[PDB]
Amino acid sequence: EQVCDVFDIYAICACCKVESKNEGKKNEVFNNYTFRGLGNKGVLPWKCISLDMKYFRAVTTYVNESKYEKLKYKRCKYLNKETKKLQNVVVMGRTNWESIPKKFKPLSNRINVILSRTLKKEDFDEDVYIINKVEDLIVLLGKLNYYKCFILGGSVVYQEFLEKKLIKKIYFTRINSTYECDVFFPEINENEYQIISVSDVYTSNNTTLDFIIYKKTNNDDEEEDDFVYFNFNKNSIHPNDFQIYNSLKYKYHPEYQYLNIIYDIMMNGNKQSDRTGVGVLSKFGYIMKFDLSQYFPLLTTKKLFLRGIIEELLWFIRGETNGNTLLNKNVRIWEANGTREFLDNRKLFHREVNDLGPIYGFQWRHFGAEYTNMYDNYENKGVDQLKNIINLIKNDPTSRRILLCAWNVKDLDQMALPPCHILCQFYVFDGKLSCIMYQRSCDLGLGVPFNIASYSIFTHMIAQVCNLQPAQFIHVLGNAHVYNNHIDSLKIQLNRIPYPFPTLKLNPDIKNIEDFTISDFTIQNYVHHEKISMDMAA
Amino acid sequence: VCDVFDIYAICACCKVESGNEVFNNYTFRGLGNKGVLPWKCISLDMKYFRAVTTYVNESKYEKLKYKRCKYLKLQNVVVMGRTNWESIPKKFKPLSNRINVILSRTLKKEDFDEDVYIINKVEDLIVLLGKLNYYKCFILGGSVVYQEFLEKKLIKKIYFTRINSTYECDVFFPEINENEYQIISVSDVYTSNNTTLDFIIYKKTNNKDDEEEDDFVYFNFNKEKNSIHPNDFQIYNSLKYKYHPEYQYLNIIYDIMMNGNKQSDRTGVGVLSKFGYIMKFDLSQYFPLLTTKKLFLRGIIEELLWFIRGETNGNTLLNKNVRIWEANGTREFLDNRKLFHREVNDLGPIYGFQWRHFGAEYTNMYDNYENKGVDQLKNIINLIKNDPTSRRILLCAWNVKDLDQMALPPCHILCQFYVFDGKLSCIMYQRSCDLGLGVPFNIASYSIFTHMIAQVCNLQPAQFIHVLGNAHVYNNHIDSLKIQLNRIPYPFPTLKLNPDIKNIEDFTISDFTIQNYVHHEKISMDMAA
Numbered sequence A: 001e002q003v004c005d006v007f008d009i010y011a012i013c014a015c016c017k018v019e020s021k022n023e024g025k026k027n028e029v030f031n032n033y034t035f036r037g038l039g040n041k042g043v044l045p046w047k048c049i050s051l052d053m054k055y056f057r058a059v060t061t062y063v064n065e066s067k068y069e070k071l072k073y074k075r076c077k078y079l080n081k082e083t084k085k086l087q088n089v090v091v092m093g094r095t096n097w098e099s100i101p102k103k104f105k106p107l108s109n110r111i112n113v114i115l116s117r118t119l120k121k122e123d124f125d126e127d128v129y130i131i132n133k134v135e136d137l138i139v140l141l142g143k144l145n146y147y148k149c150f151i152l153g154g155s156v157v158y159q160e161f162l163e164k165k166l167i168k169k170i171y172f173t174r175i176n177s178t179y180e181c182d183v184f185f186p187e188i189n190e191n192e193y194q195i196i197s198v199s200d201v202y203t204s205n206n207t208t209l210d211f212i213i214y215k216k217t218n219n220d221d222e223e224e225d226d227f228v229y230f231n232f233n234k235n236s237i238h239p240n241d242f243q244i245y246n247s248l249k250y251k252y253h254p255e256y257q258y259l260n261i262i263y264d265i266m267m268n269g270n271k272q273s274d275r276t277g278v279g280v281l282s283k284f285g286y287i288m289k290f291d292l293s294q295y296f297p298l299l300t301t302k303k304l305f306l307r308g309i310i311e312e313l314l315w316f317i318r319g320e321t322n323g324n325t326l327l328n329k330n331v332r333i334w335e336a337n338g339t340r341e342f343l344d345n346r347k348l349f350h351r352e353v354n355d356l357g358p359i360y361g362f363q364w365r366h367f368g369a370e371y372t373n374m375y376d377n378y379e380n381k382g383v384d385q386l387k388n389i390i391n392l393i394k395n396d397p398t399s400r401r402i403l404l405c406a407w408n409v410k411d412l413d414q415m416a417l418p419p420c421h422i423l424c425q426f427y428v429f430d431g432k433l434s435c436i437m438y439q440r441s442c443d444l445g446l447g448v449p450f451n452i453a454s455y456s457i458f459t460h461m462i463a464q465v466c467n468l469q470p471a472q473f474i475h476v477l478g479n480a481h482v483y484n485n486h487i488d489s490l491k492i493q494l495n496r497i498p499y500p501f502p503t504l505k506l507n508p509d510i511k512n513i514e515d516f517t518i519s520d521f522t523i524q525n526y527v528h529h530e531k532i533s534m535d536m537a538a
Numbered sequence B: 001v002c003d004v005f006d007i008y009a010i011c012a013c014c015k016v017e018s019g020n021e022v023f024n025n026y027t028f029r030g031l032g033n034k035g036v037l038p039w040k041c042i043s044l045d046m047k048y049f050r051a052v053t054t055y056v057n058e059s060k061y062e063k064l065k066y067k068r069c070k071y072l073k074l075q076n077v078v079v080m081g082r083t084n085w086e087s088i089p090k091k092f093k094p095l096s097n098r099i100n101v102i103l104s105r106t107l108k109k110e111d112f113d114e115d116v117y118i119i120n121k122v123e124d125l126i127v128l129l130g131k132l133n134y135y136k137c138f139i140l141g142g143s144v145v146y147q148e149f150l151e152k153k154l155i156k157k158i159y160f161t162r163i164n165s166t167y168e169c170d171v172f173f174p175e176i177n178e179n180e181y182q183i184i185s186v187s188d189v190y191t192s193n194n195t196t197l198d199f200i201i202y203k204k205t206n207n208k209d210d211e212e213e214d215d216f217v218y219f220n221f222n223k224e225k226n227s228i229h230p231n232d233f234q235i236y237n238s239l240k241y242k243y244h245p246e247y248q249y250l251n252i253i254y255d256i257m258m259n260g261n262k263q264s265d266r267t268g269v270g271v272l273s274k275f276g277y278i279m280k281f282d283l284s285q286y287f288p289l290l291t292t293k294k295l296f297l298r299g300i301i302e303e304l305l306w307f308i309r310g311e312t313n314g315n316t317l318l319n320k321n322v323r324i325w326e327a328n329g330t331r332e333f334l335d336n337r338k339l340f341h342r343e344v345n346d347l348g349p350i351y352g353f354q355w356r357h358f359g360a361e362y363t364n365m366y367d368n369y370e371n372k373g374v375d376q377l378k379n380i381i382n383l384i385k386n387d388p389t390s391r392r393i394l395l396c397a398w399n400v401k402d403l404d405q406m407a408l409p410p411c412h413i414l415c416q417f418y419v420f421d422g423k424l425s426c427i428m429y430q431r432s433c434d435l436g437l438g439v440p441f442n443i444a445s446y447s448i449f450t451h452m453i454a455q456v457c458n459l460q461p462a463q464f465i466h467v468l469g470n471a472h473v474y475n476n477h478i479d480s481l482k483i484q485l486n487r488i489p490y491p492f493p494t495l496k497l498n499p500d501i502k503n504i505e506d507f508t509i510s511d512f513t514i515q516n517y518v519h520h521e522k523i524s525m526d527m528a529a
């Protein structure tokens, strides 16, 4: 029995990102050591992240009474002993202690302990224990009645507790912003500690953050029976391939909505072939939800560029169907569907190369108008859906008819291809806008991460020009499939741990949906793993 | 008394041949016929029975050995009547892995061996259970065994299989006093041997690592509603396991009632609403016709047959006493739609028109539209038979161009189909869902449609997946939904189609039969007049 398990000694910290160099930091690398800034100038690097404070307080103050008698027995056995409100103990480097504002001290409902050489009990007015050696802390825990013991930091205090192998778990807040720092959390050794849980992502005081838990690596109840009774009733891909993924206990990060779908398709999907030969695995009907008020959901388990998909979005809004516009901005999302061959194979022998036909943009601005060619002038022809939904959101917000629909049955065969994203339904409550997008056909490997981002942005754009705040983006998948030759790559991705999401900012001067331009969009604090080739062949 | 020795009954009860029929828990009471079981094989019940009576947990025994002695290879005790035993096929006797026990008089240990037990009277088993080292004790019954054991109040849990079909029977399970026992769990619904069934669990009433368990609390540090009370949902909350598919609809009602946003609507009524729910029903296992209130299906089938005809004439339905579209077809309703030049009950280019003629120009409800617009319905049928893995098998009612001409825009946006291994699944997207009156009907409708489409395409139905956009409960529906929430569902009915019908246009009202619909009594959602 080691000292850490017996005495239930844990660390808890909060780390931001810190100011590196600008010599090629458009394309920089990220890892766990990305978040490492602990202090600056004897205080915290940031003003107030109240949600972290709330977390910190709740963890360090939470005790479970019933669980104690069994810890009150474990510790006693270790020290050779037989067997008013239970409190946790918290330990602080002296400098850490000085940094805390007076009105917070001693930390309420906790047994305060302070590490110091240069100071002694006489230097303190407060109900606190002073100790001058780590060893004395162990001696003290021996004597006291407590639930858990949390090391509250000091990088010095952190360093010495890790290297003595005293920390059973690190409760770690990732603060997804950059600040000046002079003090840093020790680099965690991946062989000594592994992440086992990952929380939801939140925003607090203008930054996203999540909370992760590292664990030390070792290298009534009648109704519990009823559960077994009621449980009395394909692809054998290999366990080990999901070592990391399957080791996590809590996968609460929103990116897991995506990743669990992949997992599900890999384990349970249906083997099917296209009329061609390319094999997929597929399943029918999934849903993901995303809280746009808390983060922007750009996947972090691989790198995504957003310029293209933003250009495509602006191109939809202008009602364009001319692929050349996109190619001239070096965006090739639609190149393949615009070739002479692709159009001929679509029986559009009379369609000019890159004239995509009555697709999205056209349906959004001119539904029902007779498509001629990509250069025609369609103004006041067809139904301006975009305008009407913006008008409904503004003037009739309780409407259950706020739908934007790409799927024009009549023009389907004239489109280079039918829309993958069928429709958008909007919802308004309490000055907040939510949006369901229904997608009939979903390539999970490449399509889906881009599609989540596109419609997230669109919700922001619509909300803003209607003076509302974005709320939920809800993505419905009909035929959801993975390409067989993406399997190895998705395997890799599925074992990366997500990072806290970035945030999206829109120029606030833009007040009509038609008036956005590319430089009106900024992603801030995109932290992400390395880019992946989905087929390992190119 | 019973709490200590862990004595439970386990049964299976079908419905009995009875010359308005009322349903309650007593509806399921058929135990046996001619000294045999009323039904032939029901293989899933035999699997449940074997699994429950055999299963043991050794790491939970010490707690019970502690309990029993104080008061004074681990297996379970199984107890039956003589008649009961003399009907089990010998190739199953002795009951593999179970302390076999018989409660008889006429015979004793002078006939059969000592490894198998035989006992004298009711309170000659308790005595025999001190002597014994066993997990739990199951009364496999026989009518009188059950009877006398419930009589003496020696039963803690009844594990009760509801067989949702009717057979001739000579013996019945006794009435269970619902003041003495209550249901705390209800399972998923299943099809076995041409019948649906579920498994419920009765409980006697009380009427006088841990590392990660903490970590769970932390992740909850930030957790967060409406003027609905707790004690009104007594029965609903007092259930531990709610695996019956009907809870997919009821849980949504609960969620909107607890967490719904207050809104006043189109007319000024009051609704609670949320946005985005999903439900899934396994059509190969049952027909999802709600059981916690009475539903009628003639009208909705006629609406569907009307849609398939491509009809937009509301008078066709009114002449059959299908009044679903009545209010939408009145002079006054259409004038308020700015449809001053539309004949009454001419609903415009709605569903039928869209499914058979999307894109054609609408004139009036009497015109001939033959070969005008796209026949979506014909097209999706061809895709299903000839290109089953297509991801474009969709039937879309929402014609943006025609919306304003419709009496009202479709509540039911679209249907997507999916085919794999001879089976057909369907997703229906619904933009606006009146959870109280509308959605129970909507579920039945597209379920039936999915059957119709599968059959004409030579496939088996698989899943109906209902996606809900704006999901709302009417405020004046609240009291009734509360009553409904505390009702326990019954096993679902089945839908039979006439197997002769092989083309989508050939169905008639007489080609549809609902079987074994067991249901609670009718509720009026608006409890006013």
Ligand SMILES: NC(=O)C1=CN([C@@H]2O[C@H](COP(=O)(O)OP(=O)(O)OC[C@H]3O[C@@H](n4cnc5c(N)ncnc54)[C@H](OP(=O)(O)O)[C@@H]3O)[C@@H](O)[C@H]2O)C=CC1
Residues within 6 Å of the ligand: A012, A013, A014, A015, A037, A038, A039, A040, A041, A042, A043, A044, A092, A093, A094, A095, A096, A097, A099, A115, A116, A117, A118, A119, A131, A132, A133, A134, A152, A153, A154, A155, A156, A157, A158, A160, A183
């Ligand atoms: N964001 C976060 O999660 C956290 C941030 N912080 C920040 O970090 C900074 C402080 O970190 P740091 O400079 O490392 O200071 P520390 O809190 O680590 O304090 C170090 C001091 O504590 C005492 N001490 C440490 N180890 C021993 C030992 N075992 N025996 C006796 N005394 C010991 C000594 O006190 P003495 O000088 O009296 O001899 C030493 O100088 C501040 O900016 C603070 O705001 C702190 C905690 C958490």
Ligand SMILES: NC(=O)C1=CN([C@@H]2O[C@H](COP(=O)(O)OP(=O)(O)OC[C@H]3O[C@@H](n4cnc5c(N)ncnc54)[C@H](OP(=O)(O)O)[C@@H]3O)[C@@H](O)[C@H]2O)C=CC1
Residues within 6 Å of the ligand: B010, B011, B012, B013, B030, B031, B032, B033, B034, B035, B036, B037, B080, B081, B082, B083, B084, B085, B087, B103, B104, B105, B106, B107, B119, B120, B121, B122, B140, B141, B142, B143, B144, B145, B146, B148, B171
């Ligand atoms: N569907 C289901 O869940 C089940 C159905 N069954 C069916 O039930 C039918 C049998 O029911 P039924 O005959 O009414 O009941 P039993 O099978 O329990 O048979 C009753 C017999 O048990 C003995 N017995 C009853 N009370 C006592 C007592 N106080 N002390 C000692 N012995 C007693 C008597 O046998 P003796 O002559 O020796 O005195 C009596 O004749 C069968 O057809 C069987 O298939 C059986 C179990 C479960």
Ligand SMILES: Cc1nc(N)nc(N)c1OCCCOc1cc(Cl)c(Cl)cc1Cl
Residues within 6 Å of the ligand: A012, A013, A014, A043, A044, A052, A053, A056, A096, A099, A100, A101, A104, A151, A152, A153, A172, A173
């Ligand atoms: C803030 C924090 N957050 C996390 N997740 N872990 C910590 N150890 C931590 O530090 C706890 C000790 C410092 O406490 C404070 C410091 C300052 Cl500067 C202020 Cl203003 C308030 C408190 Cl409580």
Ligand SMILES: Cc1nc(N)nc(N)c1OCCCOc1cc(Cl)c(Cl)cc1Cl
Residues within 6 Å of the ligand: B010, B011, B012, B035, B036, B037, B045, B046, B048, B049, B084, B087, B088, B089, B092, B139, B140, B141, B161
């Ligand atoms: C089958 C069953 N299922 C449940 N759920 N409970 C029972 N008591 C039960 O009866 C078990 C005792 C009767 O057993 C049999 C009777 C006949 Cl007739 C045959 Cl063929 C086979 C068995 Cl096992």
